[PDB]
Specification:
monomer; 5 residues; little secondary structure; 0% strand
Length: 5
């Protein structure tokens, strides 16, 4: 959290 999370 989609840095990828």
């Amino acid at each position: 959290x989609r840095x990828x999370x």
